PDB file of all heavy atoms in Angstrom:
ATOM      1  N   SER E   1     -13.813  35.288 -31.195  1.00 33.59           N
ATOM      2  CA  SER E   1     -12.497  36.053 -31.752  1.00 33.59           C
ATOM      3  C   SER E   1     -11.508  35.749 -30.752  1.00 33.59           C
ATOM      4  O   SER E   1     -11.803  35.340 -29.604  1.00 33.59           O
ATOM      5  CB  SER E   1     -12.828  37.536 -31.776  1.00 33.59           C
ATOM      6  OG  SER E   1     -12.957  38.070 -30.449  1.00 33.59           O
ATOM      7  N   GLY E   2     -10.252  35.807 -31.165  1.00 33.65           N
ATOM      8  CA  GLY E   2      -9.090  35.754 -30.376  1.00 33.65           C
ATOM      9  C   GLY E   2      -7.948  34.995 -30.957  1.00 33.65           C
ATOM     10  O   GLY E   2      -8.114  34.627 -32.199  1.00 33.65           O
ATOM     11  N   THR E   3      -6.895  34.814 -30.194  1.00 33.76           N
ATOM     12  CA  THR E   3      -5.658  34.199 -30.751  1.00 33.76           C
ATOM     13  C   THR E   3      -5.428  32.929 -29.880  1.00 33.76           C
ATOM     14  O   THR E   3      -5.490  32.950 -28.589  1.00 33.76           O
ATOM     15  CB  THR E   3      -4.493  35.250 -30.532  1.00 33.76           C
ATOM     16  OG1 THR E   3      -4.879  36.407 -31.369  1.00 33.76           O
ATOM     17  CG2 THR E   3      -3.252  34.667 -31.035  1.00 33.76           C
ATOM     18  N   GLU E   4      -4.929  31.854 -30.576  1.00 31.94           N
ATOM     19  CA  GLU E   4      -4.535  30.642 -29.969  1.00 31.94           C
ATOM     20  C   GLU E   4      -3.155  30.240 -30.463  1.00 31.94           C
ATOM     21  O   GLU E   4      -2.916  30.189 -31.660  1.00 31.94           O
ATOM     22  CB  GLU E   4      -5.567  29.599 -30.235  1.00 31.94           C
ATOM     23  CG  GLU E   4      -5.227  28.172 -29.658  1.00 31.94           C
ATOM     24  CD  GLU E   4      -6.307  27.175 -29.907  1.00 31.94           C
ATOM     25  OE1 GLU E   4      -7.351  27.583 -30.559  1.00 31.94           O
ATOM     26  OE2 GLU E   4      -6.186  26.019 -29.488  1.00 31.94           O
ATOM     27  N   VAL E   5      -2.235  30.013 -29.551  1.00 33.22           N
ATOM     28  CA  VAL E   5      -0.813  29.673 -29.916  1.00 33.22           C
ATOM     29  C   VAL E   5      -0.582  28.262 -29.149  1.00 33.22           C
ATOM     30  O   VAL E   5      -0.563  28.252 -27.954  1.00 33.22           O
ATOM     31  CB  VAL E   5       0.124  30.714 -29.419  1.00 33.22           C
ATOM     32  CG1 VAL E   5       1.530  30.305 -29.747  1.00 33.22           C
ATOM     33  CG2 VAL E   5      -0.213  32.067 -30.130  1.00 33.22           C
ATOM     34  N   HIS E   6      -0.299  27.302 -29.982  1.00 34.96           N
ATOM     35  CA  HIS E   6       0.099  25.946 -29.486  1.00 34.96           C
ATOM     36  C   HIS E   6       1.566  25.820 -29.962  1.00 34.96           C
ATOM     37  O   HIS E   6       1.897  25.729 -31.143  1.00 34.96           O
ATOM     38  CB  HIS E   6      -0.793  24.819 -30.099  1.00 34.96           C
ATOM     39  CG  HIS E   6      -0.391  23.485 -29.806  1.00 34.96           C
ATOM     40  ND1 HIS E   6      -0.766  22.392 -30.473  1.00 34.96           N
ATOM     41  CD2 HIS E   6       0.191  22.993 -28.616  1.00 34.96           C
ATOM     42  CE1 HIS E   6      -0.256  21.320 -29.899  1.00 34.96           C
ATOM     43  NE2 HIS E   6       0.383  21.681 -28.797  1.00 34.96           N
ATOM     44  N   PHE E   7       2.480  25.705 -28.933  1.00 36.79           N
ATOM     45  CA  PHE E   7       3.833  25.577 -29.232  1.00 36.79           C
ATOM     46  C   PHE E   7       4.537  24.361 -28.519  1.00 36.79           C
ATOM     47  O   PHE E   7       4.084  24.096 -27.371  1.00 36.79           O
ATOM     48  CB  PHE E   7       4.618  26.947 -28.934  1.00 36.79           C
ATOM     49  CG  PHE E   7       4.781  27.350 -27.543  1.00 36.79           C
ATOM     50  CD1 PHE E   7       5.784  26.918 -26.780  1.00 36.79           C
ATOM     51  CD2 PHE E   7       3.724  28.122 -26.971  1.00 36.79           C
ATOM     52  CE1 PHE E   7       5.927  27.264 -25.466  1.00 36.79           C
ATOM     53  CE2 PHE E   7       3.876  28.495 -25.617  1.00 36.79           C
ATOM     54  CZ  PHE E   7       4.979  28.066 -24.883  1.00 36.79           C
ATOM     55  N   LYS E   8       5.477  23.882 -29.194  1.00 34.95           N
ATOM     56  CA  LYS E   8       6.275  22.680 -28.709  1.00 34.95           C
ATOM     57  C   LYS E   8       7.744  23.206 -28.561  1.00 34.95           C
ATOM     58  O   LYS E   8       8.393  23.385 -29.462  1.00 34.95           O
ATOM     59  CB  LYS E   8       6.163  21.533 -29.672  1.00 34.95           C
ATOM     60  CG  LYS E   8       4.720  21.254 -30.144  1.00 34.95           C
ATOM     61  CD  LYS E   8       4.633  19.832 -30.638  1.00 34.95           C
ATOM     62  CE  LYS E   8       3.144  19.360 -30.819  1.00 34.95           C
ATOM     63  NZ  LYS E   8       2.484  20.028 -31.844  1.00 34.95           N
ATOM     64  N   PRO E   9       8.196  23.504 -27.302  1.00 36.31           N
ATOM     65  CA  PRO E   9       9.569  23.929 -27.170  1.00 36.31           C
ATOM     66  C   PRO E   9      10.635  22.995 -27.788  1.00 36.31           C
ATOM     67  O   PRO E   9      10.459  21.781 -27.688  1.00 36.31           O
ATOM     68  CB  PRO E   9       9.786  24.031 -25.657  1.00 36.31           C
ATOM     69  CG  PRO E   9       8.386  24.265 -25.170  1.00 36.31           C
ATOM     70  CD  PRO E   9       7.509  23.427 -26.070  1.00 36.31           C
ATOM     71  N   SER E  10      11.593  23.540 -28.529  1.00 39.93           N
ATOM     72  CA  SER E  10      12.550  22.715 -29.194  1.00 39.93           C
ATOM     73  C   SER E  10      13.502  22.009 -28.189  1.00 39.93           C
ATOM     74  O   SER E  10      14.142  22.700 -27.405  1.00 39.93           O
ATOM     75  CB  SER E  10      13.365  23.560 -30.207  1.00 39.93           C
ATOM     76  OG  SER E  10      14.413  22.763 -30.748  1.00 39.93           O
ATOM     77  N   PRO E  11      13.563  20.706 -28.268  1.00 41.24           N
ATOM     78  CA  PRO E  11      14.618  19.983 -27.478  1.00 41.24           C
ATOM     79  C   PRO E  11      16.093  20.276 -27.989  1.00 41.24           C
ATOM     80  O   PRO E  11      16.984  19.851 -27.215  1.00 41.24           O
ATOM     81  CB  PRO E  11      14.190  18.558 -27.682  1.00 41.24           C
ATOM     82  CG  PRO E  11      13.566  18.347 -28.978  1.00 41.24           C
ATOM     83  CD  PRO E  11      12.833  19.750 -29.137  1.00 41.24           C
ATOM     84  N   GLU E  12      16.285  20.853 -29.091  1.00 42.73           N
ATOM     85  CA  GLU E  12      17.610  21.390 -29.592  1.00 42.73           C
ATOM     86  C   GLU E  12      18.033  22.589 -28.828  1.00 42.73           C
ATOM     87  O   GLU E  12      19.257  22.946 -28.749  1.00 42.73           O
ATOM     88  CB  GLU E  12      17.573  21.646 -31.091  1.00 42.73           C
ATOM     89  CG  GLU E  12      17.404  20.255 -31.852  1.00 42.73           C
ATOM     90  CD  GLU E  12      17.535  20.423 -33.422  1.00 42.73           C
ATOM     91  OE1 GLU E  12      17.070  21.408 -33.968  1.00 42.73           O
ATOM     92  OE2 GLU E  12      18.090  19.544 -34.030  1.00 42.73           O
ATOM     93  N   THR E  13      17.030  23.360 -28.289  1.00 38.34           N
ATOM     94  CA  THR E  13      17.334  24.539 -27.484  1.00 38.34           C
ATOM     95  C   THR E  13      17.308  24.327 -25.936  1.00 38.34           C
ATOM     96  O   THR E  13      18.172  24.758 -25.275  1.00 38.34           O
ATOM     97  CB  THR E  13      16.274  25.649 -27.912  1.00 38.34           C
ATOM     98  OG1 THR E  13      16.433  25.997 -29.231  1.00 38.34           O
ATOM     99  CG2 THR E  13      16.404  26.899 -26.995  1.00 38.34           C
ATOM    100  N   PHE E  14      16.282  23.567 -25.552  1.00 36.79           N
ATOM    101  CA  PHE E  14      15.924  23.402 -24.167  1.00 36.79           C
ATOM    102  C   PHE E  14      16.323  21.998 -23.691  1.00 36.79           C
ATOM    103  O   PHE E  14      15.959  21.068 -24.364  1.00 36.79           O
ATOM    104  CB  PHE E  14      14.440  23.681 -23.740  1.00 36.79           C
ATOM    105  CG  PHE E  14      14.063  25.092 -24.062  1.00 36.79           C
ATOM    106  CD1 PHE E  14      13.316  25.369 -25.336  1.00 36.79           C
ATOM    107  CD2 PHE E  14      14.292  26.142 -23.255  1.00 36.79           C
ATOM    108  CE1 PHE E  14      13.015  26.635 -25.603  1.00 36.79           C
ATOM    109  CE2 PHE E  14      13.904  27.459 -23.584  1.00 36.79           C
ATOM    110  CZ  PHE E  14      13.255  27.678 -24.683  1.00 36.79           C
ATOM    111  N   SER E  15      16.954  21.897 -22.588  1.00 37.12           N
ATOM    112  CA  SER E  15      17.039  20.555 -21.805  1.00 37.12           C
ATOM    113  C   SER E  15      16.028  20.480 -20.744  1.00 37.12           C
ATOM    114  O   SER E  15      15.483  21.523 -20.403  1.00 37.12           O
ATOM    115  CB  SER E  15      18.534  20.407 -21.221  1.00 37.12           C
ATOM    116  OG  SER E  15      18.652  21.418 -20.211  1.00 37.12           O
ATOM    117  N   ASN E  16      15.671  19.253 -20.318  1.00 37.18           N
ATOM    118  CA  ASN E  16      14.667  19.026 -19.208  1.00 37.18           C
ATOM    119  C   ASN E  16      13.330  19.697 -19.519  1.00 37.18           C
ATOM    120  O   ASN E  16      12.835  20.602 -18.734  1.00 37.18           O
ATOM    121  CB  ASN E  16      15.206  19.428 -17.884  1.00 37.18           C
ATOM    122  CG  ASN E  16      14.472  18.877 -16.745  1.00 37.18           C
ATOM    123  OD1 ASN E  16      13.995  17.670 -16.817  1.00 37.18           O
ATOM    124  ND2 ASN E  16      14.331  19.611 -15.628  1.00 37.18           N
ATOM    125  N   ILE E  17      12.728  19.474 -20.718  1.00 42.49           N
ATOM    126  CA  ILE E  17      11.450  20.097 -21.116  1.00 42.49           C
ATOM    127  C   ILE E  17      10.390  19.491 -20.352  1.00 42.49           C
ATOM    128  O   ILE E  17       9.653  18.499 -20.737  1.00 42.49           O
ATOM    129  CB  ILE E  17      11.267  20.082 -22.547  1.00 42.49           C
ATOM    130  CG1 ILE E  17      12.371  20.659 -23.366  1.00 42.49           C
ATOM    131  CG2 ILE E  17       9.866  20.560 -22.990  1.00 42.49           C
ATOM    132  CD1 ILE E  17      12.314  20.428 -24.840  1.00 42.49           C
ATOM    133  N   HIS E  18      10.143  20.048 -19.110  1.00 42.08           N
ATOM    134  CA  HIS E  18       9.084  19.645 -18.188  1.00 42.08           C
ATOM    135  C   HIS E  18       8.539  20.853 -17.425  1.00 42.08           C
ATOM    136  O   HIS E  18       9.352  21.542 -16.810  1.00 42.08           O
ATOM    137  CB  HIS E  18       9.617  18.620 -17.166  1.00 42.08           C
ATOM    138  CG  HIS E  18       9.898  17.254 -17.802  1.00 42.08           C
ATOM    139  ND1 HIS E  18       8.907  16.432 -18.381  1.00 42.08           N
ATOM    140  CD2 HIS E  18      11.051  16.677 -18.035  1.00 42.08           C
ATOM    141  CE1 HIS E  18       9.426  15.306 -18.893  1.00 42.08           C
ATOM    142  NE2 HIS E  18      10.784  15.453 -18.697  1.00 42.08           N
ATOM    143  N   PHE E  19       7.370  21.243 -17.783  1.00 39.26           N
ATOM    144  CA  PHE E  19       6.737  22.445 -17.192  1.00 39.26           C
ATOM    145  C   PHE E  19       6.399  22.145 -15.779  1.00 39.26           C
ATOM    146  O   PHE E  19       6.041  21.060 -15.261  1.00 39.26           O
ATOM    147  CB  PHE E  19       5.490  22.761 -18.036  1.00 39.26           C
ATOM    148  CG  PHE E  19       5.876  23.440 -19.286  1.00 39.26           C
ATOM    149  CD1 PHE E  19       6.062  22.808 -20.462  1.00 39.26           C
ATOM    150  CD2 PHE E  19       6.408  24.828 -19.288  1.00 39.26           C
ATOM    151  CE1 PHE E  19       6.417  23.508 -21.665  1.00 39.26           C
ATOM    152  CE2 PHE E  19       6.853  25.476 -20.395  1.00 39.26           C
ATOM    153  CZ  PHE E  19       6.822  24.783 -21.523  1.00 39.26           C
ATOM    154  N   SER E  20       6.476  23.251 -14.966  1.00 35.89           N
ATOM    155  CA  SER E  20       6.042  23.220 -13.487  1.00 35.89           C
ATOM    156  C   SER E  20       4.714  23.958 -13.358  1.00 35.89           C
ATOM    157  O   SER E  20       4.567  25.094 -13.640  1.00 35.89           O
ATOM    158  CB  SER E  20       7.178  23.908 -12.747  1.00 35.89           C
ATOM    159  OG  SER E  20       6.696  24.129 -11.425  1.00 35.89           O
ATOM    160  N   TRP E  21       3.821  23.112 -12.839  1.00 37.65           N
ATOM    161  CA  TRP E  21       2.477  23.711 -12.436  1.00 37.65           C
ATOM    162  C   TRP E  21       2.757  24.852 -11.378  1.00 37.65           C
ATOM    163  O   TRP E  21       2.151  25.970 -11.603  1.00 37.65           O
ATOM    164  CB  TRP E  21       1.643  22.582 -11.655  1.00 37.65           C
ATOM    165  CG  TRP E  21       0.396  23.197 -11.139  1.00 37.65           C
ATOM    166  CD1 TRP E  21       0.384  23.736  -9.876  1.00 37.65           C
ATOM    167  CD2 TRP E  21      -0.886  23.436 -11.776  1.00 37.65           C
ATOM    168  NE1 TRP E  21      -0.917  24.285  -9.642  1.00 37.65           N
ATOM    169  CE2 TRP E  21      -1.613  24.121 -10.853  1.00 37.65           C
ATOM    170  CE3 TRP E  21      -1.434  23.077 -12.927  1.00 37.65           C
ATOM    171  CZ2 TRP E  21      -2.984  24.485 -11.035  1.00 37.65           C
ATOM    172  CZ3 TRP E  21      -2.710  23.512 -13.277  1.00 37.65           C
ATOM    173  CH2 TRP E  21      -3.434  24.122 -12.272  1.00 37.65           C
ATOM    174  N   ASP E  22       3.596  24.658 -10.515  1.00 34.94           N
ATOM    175  CA  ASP E  22       3.863  25.623  -9.333  1.00 34.94           C
ATOM    176  C   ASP E  22       4.351  26.908 -10.035  1.00 34.94           C
ATOM    177  O   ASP E  22       3.803  27.994  -9.575  1.00 34.94           O
ATOM    178  CB  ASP E  22       4.749  25.079  -8.305  1.00 34.94           C
ATOM    179  CG  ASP E  22       4.116  24.007  -7.402  1.00 34.94           C
ATOM    180  OD1 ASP E  22       2.890  23.822  -7.506  1.00 34.94           O
ATOM    181  OD2 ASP E  22       4.771  23.485  -6.583  1.00 34.94           O
ATOM    182  N   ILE E  23       5.256  26.849 -10.906  1.00 37.09           N
ATOM    183  CA  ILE E  23       5.940  28.144 -11.485  1.00 37.09           C
ATOM    184  C   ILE E  23       4.846  28.806 -12.283  1.00 37.09           C
ATOM    185  O   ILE E  23       4.736  30.013 -12.079  1.00 37.09           O
ATOM    186  CB  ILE E  23       7.178  27.789 -12.332  1.00 37.09           C
ATOM    187  CG1 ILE E  23       8.271  27.331 -11.383  1.00 37.09           C
ATOM    188  CG2 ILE E  23       7.589  28.953 -13.184  1.00 37.09           C
ATOM    189  CD1 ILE E  23       9.521  26.762 -12.158  1.00 37.09           C
ATOM    190  N   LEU E  24       4.073  28.089 -13.128  1.00 41.72           N
ATOM    191  CA  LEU E  24       3.089  28.686 -13.923  1.00 41.72           C
ATOM    192  C   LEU E  24       1.954  29.313 -13.099  1.00 41.72           C
ATOM    193  O   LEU E  24       1.583  30.448 -13.299  1.00 41.72           O
ATOM    194  CB  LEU E  24       2.483  27.688 -14.917  1.00 41.72           C
ATOM    195  CG  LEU E  24       3.533  27.241 -15.997  1.00 41.72           C
ATOM    196  CD1 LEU E  24       2.925  26.243 -16.943  1.00 41.72           C
ATOM    197  CD2 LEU E  24       4.054  28.402 -16.856  1.00 41.72           C
ATOM    198  N   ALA E  25       1.480  28.531 -12.084  1.00 41.88           N
ATOM    199  CA  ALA E  25       0.328  28.956 -11.222  1.00 41.88           C
ATOM    200  C   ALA E  25       0.746  30.238 -10.432  1.00 41.88           C
ATOM    201  O   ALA E  25      -0.142  31.126 -10.337  1.00 41.88           O
ATOM    202  CB  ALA E  25      -0.158  27.828 -10.322  1.00 41.88           C
ATOM    203  N   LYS E  26       1.964  30.237  -9.923  1.00 41.49           N
ATOM    204  CA  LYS E  26       2.386  31.359  -9.050  1.00 41.49           C
ATOM    205  C   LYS E  26       2.351  32.695  -9.950  1.00 41.49           C
ATOM    206  O   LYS E  26       1.830  33.630  -9.476  1.00 41.49           O
ATOM    207  CB  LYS E  26       3.825  31.210  -8.566  1.00 41.49           C
ATOM    208  CG  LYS E  26       4.368  32.250  -7.689  1.00 41.49           C
ATOM    209  CD  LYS E  26       5.796  32.013  -7.226  1.00 41.49           C
ATOM    210  CE  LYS E  26       6.227  33.167  -6.371  1.00 41.49           C
ATOM    211  NZ  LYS E  26       5.413  33.396  -5.091  1.00 41.49           N
ATOM    212  N   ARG E  27       2.854  32.616 -11.162  1.00 45.29           N
ATOM    213  CA  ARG E  27       2.946  33.800 -12.064  1.00 45.29           C
ATOM    214  C   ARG E  27       1.489  34.129 -12.520  1.00 45.29           C
ATOM    215  O   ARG E  27       1.083  35.300 -12.559  1.00 45.29           O
ATOM    216  CB  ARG E  27       3.825  33.630 -13.308  1.00 45.29           C
ATOM    217  CG  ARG E  27       4.013  34.895 -14.153  1.00 45.29           C
ATOM    218  CD  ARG E  27       4.314  36.191 -13.401  1.00 45.29           C
ATOM    219  NE  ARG E  27       4.404  37.218 -14.332  1.00 45.29           N
ATOM    220  CZ  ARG E  27       4.426  38.486 -14.049  1.00 45.29           C
ATOM    221  NH1 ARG E  27       4.246  38.959 -12.863  1.00 45.29           N
ATOM    222  NH2 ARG E  27       4.613  39.347 -15.090  1.00 45.29           N
ATOM    223  N   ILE E  28       0.701  33.135 -12.878  1.00 47.73           N
ATOM    224  CA  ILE E  28      -0.677  33.357 -13.394  1.00 47.73           C
ATOM    225  C   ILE E  28      -1.525  33.998 -12.211  1.00 47.73           C
ATOM    226  O   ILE E  28      -2.310  34.965 -12.551  1.00 47.73           O
ATOM    227  CB  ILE E  28      -1.314  32.018 -13.935  1.00 47.73           C
ATOM    228  CG1 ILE E  28      -0.647  31.717 -15.157  1.00 47.73           C
ATOM    229  CG2 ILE E  28      -2.835  32.273 -14.008  1.00 47.73           C
ATOM    230  CD1 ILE E  28      -0.883  30.324 -15.632  1.00 47.73           C
ATOM    231  N   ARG E  29      -1.403  33.564 -11.011  1.00 47.11           N
ATOM    232  CA  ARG E  29      -2.065  34.144  -9.911  1.00 47.11           C
ATOM    233  C   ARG E  29      -1.671  35.623  -9.746  1.00 47.11           C
ATOM    234  O   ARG E  29      -2.607  36.406  -9.592  1.00 47.11           O
ATOM    235  CB  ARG E  29      -1.785  33.342  -8.666  1.00 47.11           C
ATOM    236  CG  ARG E  29      -2.567  33.853  -7.411  1.00 47.11           C
ATOM    237  CD  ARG E  29      -2.521  32.876  -6.196  1.00 47.11           C
ATOM    238  NE  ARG E  29      -1.105  32.630  -5.846  1.00 47.11           N
ATOM    239  CZ  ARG E  29      -0.541  31.586  -5.422  1.00 47.11           C
ATOM    240  NH1 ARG E  29      -1.275  30.436  -5.273  1.00 47.11           N
ATOM    241  NH2 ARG E  29       0.750  31.503  -5.183  1.00 47.11           N
ATOM    242  N   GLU E  30      -0.422  35.936  -9.879  1.00 43.31           N
ATOM    243  CA  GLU E  30       0.031  37.335  -9.924  1.00 43.31           C
ATOM    244  C   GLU E  30      -0.574  38.165 -11.005  1.00 43.31           C
ATOM    245  O   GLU E  30      -0.964  39.233 -10.797  1.00 43.31           O
ATOM    246  CB  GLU E  30       1.568  37.482 -10.030  1.00 43.31           C
ATOM    247  CG  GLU E  30       2.429  36.918  -9.038  1.00 43.31           C
ATOM    248  CD  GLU E  30       3.885  36.607  -9.541  1.00 43.31           C
ATOM    249  OE1 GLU E  30       4.353  37.397 -10.307  1.00 43.31           O
ATOM    250  OE2 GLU E  30       4.529  35.646  -9.013  1.00 43.31           O
ATOM    251  N   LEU E  31      -0.511  37.630 -12.349  1.00 43.49           N
ATOM    252  CA  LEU E  31      -1.073  38.280 -13.455  1.00 43.49           C
ATOM    253  C   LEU E  31      -2.583  38.518 -13.222  1.00 43.49           C
ATOM    254  O   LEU E  31      -3.150  39.605 -13.568  1.00 43.49           O
ATOM    255  CB  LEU E  31      -0.915  37.519 -14.697  1.00 43.49           C
ATOM    256  CG  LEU E  31       0.525  37.430 -15.150  1.00 43.49           C
ATOM    257  CD1 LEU E  31       0.651  36.391 -16.303  1.00 43.49           C
ATOM    258  CD2 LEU E  31       1.007  38.790 -15.686  1.00 43.49           C
ATOM    259  N   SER E  32      -3.313  37.588 -12.556  1.00 44.82           N
ATOM    260  CA  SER E  32      -4.798  37.720 -12.272  1.00 44.82           C
ATOM    261  C   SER E  32      -4.915  38.918 -11.336  1.00 44.82           C
ATOM    262  O   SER E  32      -5.842  39.866 -11.571  1.00 44.82           O
ATOM    263  CB  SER E  32      -5.273  36.459 -11.761  1.00 44.82           C
ATOM    264  OG  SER E  32      -6.629  36.627 -11.181  1.00 44.82           O
ATOM    265  N   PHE E  33      -4.086  38.944 -10.254  1.00 43.28           N
ATOM    266  CA  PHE E  33      -4.136  40.065  -9.300  1.00 43.28           C
ATOM    267  C   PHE E  33      -3.949  41.442  -9.962  1.00 43.28           C
ATOM    268  O   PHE E  33      -4.655  42.368  -9.549  1.00 43.28           O
ATOM    269  CB  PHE E  33      -3.145  39.797  -8.163  1.00 43.28           C
ATOM    270  CG  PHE E  33      -3.042  40.773  -7.005  1.00 43.28           C
ATOM    271  CD1 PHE E  33      -4.126  41.031  -6.268  1.00 43.28           C
ATOM    272  CD2 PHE E  33      -1.899  41.420  -6.715  1.00 43.28           C
ATOM    273  CE1 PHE E  33      -3.988  41.845  -5.131  1.00 43.28           C
ATOM    274  CE2 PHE E  33      -1.718  42.286  -5.665  1.00 43.28           C
ATOM    275  CZ  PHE E  33      -2.911  42.500  -4.854  1.00 43.28           C
ATOM    276  N   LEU E  34      -3.029  41.497 -10.862  1.00 44.04           N
ATOM    277  CA  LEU E  34      -2.607  42.737 -11.539  1.00 44.04           C
ATOM    278  C   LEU E  34      -3.642  43.162 -12.662  1.00 44.04           C
ATOM    279  O   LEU E  34      -3.545  44.258 -13.102  1.00 44.04           O
ATOM    280  CB  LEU E  34      -1.231  42.557 -12.107  1.00 44.04           C
ATOM    281  CG  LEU E  34      -0.071  42.424 -11.076  1.00 44.04           C
ATOM    282  CD1 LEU E  34       1.229  42.046 -11.733  1.00 44.04           C
ATOM    283  CD2 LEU E  34       0.074  43.753 -10.237  1.00 44.04           C
ATOM    284  N   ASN E  35      -4.465  42.192 -13.076  1.00 45.79           N
ATOM    285  CA  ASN E  35      -5.402  42.440 -14.159  1.00 45.79           C
ATOM    286  C   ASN E  35      -6.784  41.992 -13.774  1.00 45.79           C
ATOM    287  O   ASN E  35      -7.281  40.920 -14.168  1.00 45.79           O
ATOM    288  CB  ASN E  35      -4.871  41.656 -15.420  1.00 45.79           C
ATOM    289  CG  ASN E  35      -3.596  42.165 -15.963  1.00 45.79           C
ATOM    290  OD1 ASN E  35      -3.562  43.124 -16.699  1.00 45.79           O
ATOM    291  ND2 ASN E  35      -2.488  41.559 -15.558  1.00 45.79           N
ATOM    292  N   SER E  36      -7.488  42.803 -12.958  1.00 45.23           N
ATOM    293  CA  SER E  36      -8.775  42.573 -12.363  1.00 45.23           C
ATOM    294  C   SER E  36      -9.772  42.277 -13.520  1.00 45.23           C
ATOM    295  O   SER E  36      -9.676  42.985 -14.613  1.00 45.23           O
ATOM    296  CB  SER E  36      -9.217  43.637 -11.539  1.00 45.23           C
ATOM    297  OG  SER E  36     -10.529  43.425 -10.958  1.00 45.23           O
ATOM    298  N   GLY E  37     -10.635  41.360 -13.375  1.00 42.07           N
ATOM    299  CA  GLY E  37     -11.754  40.968 -14.302  1.00 42.07           C
ATOM    300  C   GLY E  37     -11.318  40.029 -15.358  1.00 42.07           C
ATOM    301  O   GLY E  37     -12.214  39.471 -16.086  1.00 42.07           O
ATOM    302  N   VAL E  38      -9.991  39.747 -15.593  1.00 45.69           N
ATOM    303  CA  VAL E  38      -9.502  38.793 -16.648  1.00 45.69           C
ATOM    304  C   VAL E  38      -9.527  37.390 -15.922  1.00 45.69           C
ATOM    305  O   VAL E  38      -8.868  37.233 -14.907  1.00 45.69           O
ATOM    306  CB  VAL E  38      -8.162  39.130 -17.237  1.00 45.69           C
ATOM    307  CG1 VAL E  38      -7.850  38.303 -18.482  1.00 45.69           C
ATOM    308  CG2 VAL E  38      -8.016  40.585 -17.530  1.00 45.69           C
TER     309      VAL E  38
END
């Protein structure tokens, strides 16, 4: 069971479409701390 979302950000909306490992990891580490067991 569960939900899967695969999205491609629009280049008509966003410039410089390059994800940052560091930005994602920092927030995910925080979400992990705030949500024990997930």
Side-chain angles (χ1 to χ4, degrees):
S1 71
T3 300
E4 180 176 0
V5 178
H6 178 203
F7 69 89
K8 312 197 166 74
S10 175
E12 292 186 322
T13 295
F14 300 98
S15 66
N16 195 34
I17 301 170
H18 291 292
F19 284 100
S20 168
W21 172 275
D22 285 352
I23 292 172
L24 293 178
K26 183 182 176 63
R27 181 54 177 166
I28 289 165
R29 185 166 59 214
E30 296 160 31
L31 289 171
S32 172
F33 181 61
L34 292 172
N35 296 276
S36 181
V38 194

